[PDB]
Design a protein around this nucleic acid. Sequence first.
RNA 1: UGGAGUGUGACAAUGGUGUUU
RNA 2: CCAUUACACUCCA
Length: 791
Amino acid sequence: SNFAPRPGFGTLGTKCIVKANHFLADLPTKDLNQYDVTITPEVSSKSVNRAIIAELVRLYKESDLGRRLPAYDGRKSLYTAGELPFTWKEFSVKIVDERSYKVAIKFVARANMHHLGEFLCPQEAVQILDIVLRELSVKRFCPVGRSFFSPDIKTPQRLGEGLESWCGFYQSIRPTQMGLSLNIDMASAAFIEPLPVIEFVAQLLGKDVLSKPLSDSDRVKIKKGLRGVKVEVTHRANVRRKYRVAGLTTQPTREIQHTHLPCLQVGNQKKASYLPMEACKIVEGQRYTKRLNEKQITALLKVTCQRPRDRENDILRTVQHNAYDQDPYAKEFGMNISEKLASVEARILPAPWLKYHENGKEKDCLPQVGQWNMMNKKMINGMTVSRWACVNFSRSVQENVARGFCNELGQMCEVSGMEFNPEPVIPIYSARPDQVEKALKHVYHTSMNKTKGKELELLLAILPDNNGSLYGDLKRICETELGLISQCCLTKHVFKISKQYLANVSLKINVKMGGRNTVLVDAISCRIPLVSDIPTIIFGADVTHPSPSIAAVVASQDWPEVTKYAGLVCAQAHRQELIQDLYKTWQDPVRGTVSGGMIRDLLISFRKATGQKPLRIIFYRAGVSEGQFYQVLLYELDAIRKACASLEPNYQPPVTFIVVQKRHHTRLFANNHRDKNSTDRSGNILPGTVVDTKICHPTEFDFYLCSHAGIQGTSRPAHYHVLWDENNFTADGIQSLTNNLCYTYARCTRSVSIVPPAYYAHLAAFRARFYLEVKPLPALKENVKRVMFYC
RNA sequence: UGGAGUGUGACAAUGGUGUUU
RNA sequence: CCAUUACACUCCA
Ligand SMILES: [Mg+2]
């Protein structure tokens, strides 16, 4: 059917003002007509075929069009302001490059206007606006994929050795409470720099060529750079042609004082044309597609990761130079936009109190800005360690330094709040990287032959800087068909022992061997709404594409805390959004219809872990497209509703889908960038910033939470589009729960951007690549299934 | 693979390519 | 311009 309508606008925290990149764009007021396109001969050739329509319009603008300028979609559509006098006419025009093309224009149907005004979901107004913007793009700028751009909107910075910056925008048209908002966001991509060939080559090779003899390496570099670059001949001014470059010659010019400069394969191999260098010019249309060295990489990254003030100013400059007003298409079409950034008055939620073990000189810690250290504190649950062995997989690290690091980690784990028994069961012996299977069963079975059945609890395994499938084999045979827990580190970290490194790996180990580390005061004192009254299992999900498209699910496993997330991973058909593996019913001869999947074998785990069935499910889906919400919301919910009625009949708790999307471009900036509204360090809105006002989907329920601190660049807010709910969650309730929950992250001592339930699913679906060998994945041994093996 | 954040295209392969110099 | 069969930077106590 439909989704869950928005219940209201919540109120919490300290209200403030944040400005975003959403330029208001009023829909036009003139009638629009749709005319089909039919061209013979029929070939795709989209760029060339658009020129056919352009020439047709230019030739017949007064004869038949009536001085009105049509809007051309390209592939199969065409739009016009008003109605043209004719209804069907045929004309033939030819591309200037020879086979003439005949085109017929006819009227088929017309969705005139106000198909989204009544909505504020027929996307006809959005589609027409997108078509108009794309026509403007193809008319004025040079498109490269979807983020088209051109210079003179900013001074083109020189990346180096003949490259150019050419910053530009990546717009989209999206319905919003404002009404048909425009979404200018800037993306940068290097382009090739026009220049006289002499100095161009001189700066490309770093030295002048006239004063030095030619060399093989210079020729290789020149041909690699110039393979595919367009060139314009300036030898004859009257005649100019778009001569393509096929390669570099291997013959001197003697076959213009530059005698030693070889010519080029002008045209192609069949047309052997050889001409000197200084009688030509470089065309700027093409884009650099080859590799960029790690000098130009840094030079370009300095531009695309500007501070948010420098980004909002650039975004505001893009439109003020785009000049949508006094533009022929808008004037003849009626489209009008604004030129100032959208202003909203969203509010900053407060950071939640966190409580630690009764020991330590402080049992409480509130995240000051959004990040807090574990100094002077201790974890809630410390899991004791009795048996553990260290295997070294490198030659640089010796028996002294490896054991020293391994003991420093143990001391750090002791001081962080768990027992770590030193003096390993089997001493390190620096196994060879090649005999991986032999070493990894030798270490496991030496204990069984020595300690009499005391299975290893933590097999430490230092590995070299470059994996080379060593990580894959190690942490594949270390959990498949051989149950174990590994905490592999890097050689470049063992020598550089740092307190932060040790105290952040200790946290992972403690949460990795069956325990928990931090918990909110509210969830343990029973004050979080809708989470602490009946048992809530906050799921997660993810689908990663690369070869089966593996997918993961992670659940919750306890009442007072929501910190432990054990989950399952599987494989299905290739490259599809929805996951068909949630509920599977194979046929059993002796039994009936055996029910499996993840949302059965993961609820059974919850029952075994806490003692009682869960009476509220929050499936918290992640990583889905913006247009196929419906199919996911259908299948991923029908699978749950059919699986829950299989373990025990008449049991269906209220689910609450919340799809999370981070791959969007709607930034948020603090209103006053000259005060402490930002984080006063690497400017950005304060960690925690819910924007549900004036930038959302008007008849739906979503928010642009920004719960993560911004270390560098502009923080990209997460878009928790809460699709379907049956808990009657308060709109402030979801915002408070989601901001308050992303502070219980295991590996970190910070607040993640996308929250742990939808972030663990991205790790469990990423680790299974190494396990992979429709083909079934190797079984995960029961030894590590309830214990978080990834985070 | 200590971890968070945000940055980018196959940092790279082979062959082929009409209106002339 | 057609056909073939994935990396860095920043920051942490
Ligand atoms: Mg993911």
